[PDB]
Design a protein around this ligand. Structure first.
Ligand SMILES: CCO/N=C/c1ccc(OCC[C@@H](C)CCN2CCN(c3ccncc3)C2=O)cc1
Ligand SMILES: CCO/N=C/c1ccc(OCC[C@@H](C)CCN2CCN(c3ccncc3)C2=O)cc1
Ligand SMILES: N[C@@H](CCC(=O)N[C@@H](CS)C(=O)NCC(=O)O)C(=O)O
Ligand SMILES: N[C@@H](CCC(=O)N[C@@H](CS)C(=O)NCC(=O)O)C(=O)O
Lengths: 237, 286, 281, 281, 286, 237, 60, 59, 68
């Protein structure tokens, strides 16, 4: 019949191919779908939801409930940092197991802005002011409010609104960043400081906690699907 | 007959089956039946997935006989027991519709029919003073499956231990495997920081939820529609929703070493309907 | 479409106003939809990136191994029974696709199965064998299951089958959505029986989370050739690709090792997080 | 287009004028665009030749070998571990395509990879083997790397793979432009870290000319069959063809032998030119 | 849907990805900021690749925050040191932006930000008498990578030795491998006739260049746009341009055995802009 | 299904073939290009740039800087040649490593005209006249100005313009010439002579240098891509 | 001739496939059908007929 | 309304929940120097975001 | 908190910033601090200042004042 010629790649199996194959159950009567709440169309829809950050991965606090709480007190004012965090959303131990980190560990490249939200869980009789800072890479990581004050920052005044949001904008030399620890695509640094101290009246707890969440903005994207290191196996079934 | 698209390229379907184809806010008042609720310190309310409860439509109804719609006789607020929040608490859980199995005519209709469906309104109440601190996370989970207490068998939890009723259960901070081979306990062992099902608690905010922060609000409200892979199902075999309450920040008061405050739950069925009337079911609940 | 570009960034200058978008309340249950223009001065940027590769179709567009089955053709000079393989259809024998799927509670999808077959000799004897042929038969629930490698059940008057010649391209078929519900249930919080006070304790017992919603039959695989003087051992790898997929009710992903077909976890595996100081970058 | 013919020659007679096109100045930095008609009397010629074969697309339209990988399936009667191959993707293991590409500083192109597989026996024993199948898996950066030939990483739920049966046509795939910059960098004059006075000397050290712009993952190759009583050794040759290629900033070509992945040269290889007398034809 | 072309023949695309598809002059005056230059013996000027420096456009901008444009405060002529040309000279090299790292406010802006970009104007000055003879070749190389001094390791040049600053480096006529295994020098060994990177000097005229011939002109001017594979980058990690000066014909004067003349360089940044403000960088340059 | 017949050439791999193959990374989000200076569309664009010629490949001058300079002096007039060069742009040792020669060594056939440019690097107080000659093949190579004066030639007067250009036109019997040493496609001869001598005043150097460059004209073309002998290897990687 | 590429599932036999094959008896003269009583178009037509139930399956 | 305030300069922001409004001295907002009032003749430098930003002194 | 917006004030259009100070900020306790019954209360006070519409003229080598 028709003369044909076979080309390279014949009789191979590529797991990413897209071809038609015969149906093993012809004329099957398929059940129709109903309207169920909670349909998802993109995986980036799940990365735009805030999830709590396990800041305190101490040897005695990790793998417990105490790892999500950051302790504050009414001590005299100091310029030392409250927490320090490197912007590696997929490889930082404190960011890799959040929902954003879990989704990023299935991909190789990411880009976009982030937002960190902090919530204060003290008494209504407590007051204070804090400083949340982000520093692009290249210089020494900030260790004093004096240095952190030179990068991007927000001043959080604790009142009726008990939450603050800080947006980390996209400041990169490449169009995408790798989801591993890398010097050429490092992200920067994040820290929290006391602007003033925490002040309480008598008959009030002098120690409190804050909680933190991270999520993505509407200009965030990923690419190059891959496999994760967060699940493994030794025996079949 | 060829389809031209852009990348242009051409595609043709060879088979007859598509499978073969290549691919203000602080104030709130609720009224149901003969019951009302008021709230003066609220953080608004949450409608799960943006869907309000509704009745089953003709274009999605499996059974053919006429359903029963009690309405005001069963769509009303029922108050469960009150739990005590202290500094040693790890959290509590409930199953729906399991927690309303002894609630007026709702339980009677539940145990007299073979199929039923319903949505819910959940209202959690907890108040303190301006000198208390703490935070609670309230989560609604569809298909809330918990892990057992056995490392020699799986899925061996008994029907009695998985359905506690309006009393509910509690989370624990440690996993203790049961070693009695002669008389296995056959009960859950839910760990708090794993949410009782092997997933990290920090991500539980993917589910519908709210937070009660003692310095901001004193109540939480969640509106849950009916969720399932079927249009209607058996309410006595299968639980649709689970409610989990966990302390996100421990309770603390002034300088006392043993503060305590109560937490109360009120739940209202919504748009509930039933099918398949017969003699009443008499389960073995002990 | 998913290939539509993301929104452009807008220029913003200095601001001085009463409105505070930064401060908010997370007790409500919502997420603050801030953009970089609400906190810093920004320039105008024309956006080119898109979210085409993170869609639900793209996230599942790979073939994943779900099982490895074993068959053999024994020596003619022995008494061993010929071995044929039976496998109960499920995606829970492996962990990668299981973890990817259990990001959600419900799903619908068509399926595409690919079979890769390999064979080898078992004895140093120089004995030879002619090319082999394999029969793969799908037995739905309630149909008779084979007991010998050559009994009547292999006549396949109504069960679909594939006959595969060794050394050719790997076998492939496609299946539609074949559930008895309106969607597949990845999780089921219930039982299949309700115990009754009148009846005995053992008559109402059942396993937790098990339902007949997840009974799809078995695959039976045999070598159709008659035994040679030398033994030949073959393994078949099955690869599953879901297509035309829709999902509902997202869930947090698994954080500890799987233990059985349920949500149970094993002691000694409940420490997924490593050490890191609070004030260390 | 590149197939357009070159300009015709024009007739020119004797000339007598003040203008001097021959004399010029090369200190400016330009090239004198003279034609033969400016220095000698010429006739009219209709031109037919074209420059279609020297275009950038044509200059790179061949498949060039970039690596040879080695795998084996050992004997069943030994204790040797089965060998699988890992290769880090790069065009710098060979010299021909490297020299052709390094005529320029930057480039963009899609890629086409072809795999040619050959096998042989290692022992005189008359033992036999059945046809083999090979798995080629692409592991991008950050994904788990296999450690045994049959561990879980080969399930390929998300990594693309090729399954190749021996004796059939050589395997082939195509890849788009997958860089994180706007073009590939053949040369990079810099470091990946900046050392800091406060920090220690070793904490700022890095290699010269190395950047993560050139990290593309690895290819892992294994034999999927189980070992036979006899050993079989296989080699896979990889051939790379760039297509839809664009280049920027031409450079002089390499004149001495390559030494490593940089621009370094080795002593004893710095004499590329031969002898020739000044006044000898 | 088929495409018909001429050789006629027909082609069809089968896949959705395009990857799958089968394939007066002597006189000059310059003014920048508060600085001016005049020249009376010039050979015109060279604009590299026919492209003038420009600012980054909105349709090609990666970072999202507002950039800084110092303009006159940094776009001005800076004079580096003066070198001495004798009969034993082999040539000199400089890196850009490395040579301007201590130049007024340009260096401050360079070390205070994380990203930066800029073009340049380079002016080389060398004058002699009508009884001198010689010729210099001035070349601008994008990504000017030099070879090391080690035959046991590759790419082992330290950050300090590769960034000399405004003093620059020199070429040598011979290759001397370093043999100190205990205390490696970790520095370049650039050979003049190989252009320091393994390619013949005669072909260096592929790069933008000019020639100073002592009997014709006494100055050279090169205008360099910003060249890179990225829109903007880190100026402290990566050098964009390299300037190389080599004697094409040795210097000679009358009958003296040791003539000498100075060579001076002046460089001006153009259309420079910066992004990512933070605390200042303090590199280890010794 | 459709009846087909396989023809010779099935299941072969030709490295010059042009066929479609499946994509291993479908739906990948490709980075867009930017406008970079210095784009090249043809390899003949690089052959039209002048590059210096290493005329003096003496045993002591080759592989150094002295090989690019041709020495001139103010000696009494003579008819002997200054340099001699055979027109073999790809196989002549003095032309094979120029840019034109490097590009020609990747091809088998070439055709077109050439241009040689000479630059004088003496004092401004020096004067002279030179004779640049090209002779088609067939006769004896010129060794005296008397013979060279009969072929194509230019007379270069050294003044304000310190450079001269001489065009070698296409004079061939075949339509293309081979890029190897061949008698049937030999190119001809090129030489330089003193027309008058070099004259300088007192207090001026009596010895100077000249430099030479070669490039192609706008009617130059090549064909039959091949491999070069200018790079080799012994061990992989 | 035409360049082609073979895909997975080539040279397999699926008993539920639907493909054309050559005819072994070309130009055969087929007997025409007549009108017979009792034609069936669906198997559900036979399930809508009442059939007696064996209620008493005692051992005797 | 008067209790709530937010300021944004360059890459720095400030929020306040208990404010007494704000004061503009003499009712005049800062501005650049106009051509009809400029003494020096050379081109001025305007760093803008690089220098117009909030700096925190000691406490 | 308190917020003051200061324009540029001087008898000249532009001046030397290293010789002359334009503004002075003074903070004074109008009523002394007191807390419950403690005899030694204390609270911090912080200042944040932002330049606005700043411009410069007359570029030269940098000034190195004697500040100690
Ligand atoms: C001879 C070759 O013919 N093969 C035909 C064939 C036909 C139907 C087949 O059944 C396909 C069943 C799958 C679509 C079921 C996959 N899923 C859906 C959800 N699920 C599951 C299992 C356990 N717990 C929860 C969910 C699964 O295992 C298999 C092969
Ligand atoms: C299972 C088969 O699937 N294979 C898929 C696949 C996907 C992506 C792959 O990566 C391709 C990366 C190349 C396009 C990179 C080539 N280049 C670009 C420049 N470059 C380089 C290397 C070192 N120094 C400078 C430049 C390179 O090596 C390879 C295979
Ligand atoms: N057991 C029989 C051979 C098996 C056999 O012939 N089976 C028949 C009737 S039970 C059959 O239906 N075989 C199915 C098949 O193997 O295709 C023997 O003693 O040889
Ligand atoms: N090591 C196992 C065999 C390897 C195996 O079964 N691996 C399973 C689970 S670790 C797998 O995922 N194999 C991947 C594959 O080889 O396709 C044995 O003792 O036989």
């Amino acid at each position: 019949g028709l003369p044909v010629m076979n080309t390279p790649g014949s009789n191979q199996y590529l797991t990413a191919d897209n071809f038609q194959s015969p149906c093993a159950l012809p004329e099957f009567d398929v059940t129709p779908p109903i309207d169920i709440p909670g349909e998802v169309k993109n995986m980036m829809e799940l990365a735009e939801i805030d999830t709590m950050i396990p800041f305190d991965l101490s040897a005695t606090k990790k793998n417990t409930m105490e790892m999500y709480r950051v302790r504050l007190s009414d001590k005299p004012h100091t310029d030392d940092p409250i927490l320090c965090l490197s912007l590696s959303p997929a490889s930082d131990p404190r960011l890799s197991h959040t929902m954003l980190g879990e989704i990023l560990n299935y991909y190789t490249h990411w880009a976009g802005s982030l937002k960190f939200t902090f919530m204060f869980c003290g008494s209504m009789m407590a007051t204070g002011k804090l400083l949340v800072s982000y520093a692009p890479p290249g210089a020494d990581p900030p260790k004093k409010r004096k240095e952190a004050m030179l990068g991007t920052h927000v001043i959080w005044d604790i009142g009726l609104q008990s939450s603050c949001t800080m947006v980390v904008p996209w400041i990169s030399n490449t169009t995408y960043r790798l989801t591993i620890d890398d010097s050429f695509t490092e992200g920067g640094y994040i820290s929290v400081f006391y602007q003033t101290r925490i002040v309480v009246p008598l008959s009030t707890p002098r120690e409190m906690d804050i909680l933190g969440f991270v999520s993505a903005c509407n200009d965030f994207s990923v690419r190059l699907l891959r496999d994760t290191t967060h699940i493994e196996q030794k025996a079949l079934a | 007959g060829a389809q031209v698209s852009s990348q242009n390229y051409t595609t043709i379907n060879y088979y007859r089956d598509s499978a073969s184809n290549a691919a203000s806010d602080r104030v709130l008042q609720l009224t149901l039946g003969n019951s009302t609720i008021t709230a003066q310190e609220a953080a608004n309310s949450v409608v799960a997935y943006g869907r309000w409860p509704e009745y089953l439509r003709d274009s999605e109804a499996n059974p053919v006989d006429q359903p029963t719609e009690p309405e005001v006789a069963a769509c009303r607020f029922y108050t469960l027991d009150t739990v005590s929040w202290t500094k040693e608490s790890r959290g509590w859980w409930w199953k729906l519709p399991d927690a309303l199995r002894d609630m007026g005519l709702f339980g009677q209709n539940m145990y007299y029919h073979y199929l039923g469906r319903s949505g819910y309104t959940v209202h959690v109440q907890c108040n303190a003073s301006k000198f208390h601190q703490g935070a609670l996370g309230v989560f609604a989970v569809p298909e809330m499956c918990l892990a057992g207490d056995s490392n020699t068998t799986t899925m061996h939890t008994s029907y009695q231990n998985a359905n506690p009723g309006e009393k509910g259960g509690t989370f624990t901070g440690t996993f203790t495997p049961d070693n009695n081979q002669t008389s296995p306990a056959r009960r859950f062992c839910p760990v708090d920081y794993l949410l009782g099902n092997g997933t990290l608690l920090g991500n539980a905010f993917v589910f519908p939820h709210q937070i009660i922060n003692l310095r901001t609000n004193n109540c939480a409200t969640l509106v849950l529609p009916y969720v399932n892979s079927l249009s209607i199902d058996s309410m006595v075999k299968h639980n649709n929703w689970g409610i989990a309450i966990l302390p996100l920040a421990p309770l603390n008061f002034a300088s006392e070493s043993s503060p305590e405050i109560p937490i109360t739950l009120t739940i209202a069925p919504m748009c509930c309907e039933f099918n398949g009337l017969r003699n009443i079911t008499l389960p073995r609940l002990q | 479409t998913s290939r539509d570009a993301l929104p452009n960034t807008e220029a913003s200058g200095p601001t001085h106003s009463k409105e505070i978008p930064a401060l908010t309340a997370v007790e409500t249950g919502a997420t603050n939809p801030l953009v970089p223009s609400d906190t810093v001065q920004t320039r105008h940027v024309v956006q080119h990136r898109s979210r085409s590769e993170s869609s639900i179709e793209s996230f599942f567009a790979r073939g994943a191994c779900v099982t490895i089955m074993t068959v053999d053709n024994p020596a003619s000079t022995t008494n061993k029974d010929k071995l044929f393989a039976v496998w109960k259809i499920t995606y829970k024998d492996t962990v990668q696709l299981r973890r990817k799927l259990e990001f959600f509670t419900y799903s619908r999808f068509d399926m595409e199965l690919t079979f890769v077959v390999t064979a080898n000799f078992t004895e140093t004897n120089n004995g030879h064998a002619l090319n082999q042929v394999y029969q793969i038969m799908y037995v739905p629930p309630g149909a008779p299951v084979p007991e010998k490698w050559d009994d009547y059940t292999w006549q396949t008057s109504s069960n679909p089958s594939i006959f595969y010649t060794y050394g050719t391209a790997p076998a492939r078929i496609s299946v539609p959505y074949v559930g008895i519900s309106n969607a597949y249930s990845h999780f089921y919080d219930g039982f299949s029986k309700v115990p009754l006070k009148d009846q005995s304790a053992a008559l109402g017992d059942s396993l937790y989370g098990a339902a007949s919603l997840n009974d799809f039959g078995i695959l039976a695989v045999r070598v159709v050739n008659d035994p040679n003087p030398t033994k030949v051992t073959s393994k078949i790898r099955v690869y599953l690709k879901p297509k035309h997929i829709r999902v509902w009710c997202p869930r947090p992903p698994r954080a500890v090792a799987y233990y059985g077909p349920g949500v149970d976890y094993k002691d000694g595996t409940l420490t997924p997080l490593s050490t890191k100081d609070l004030t260390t970058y």
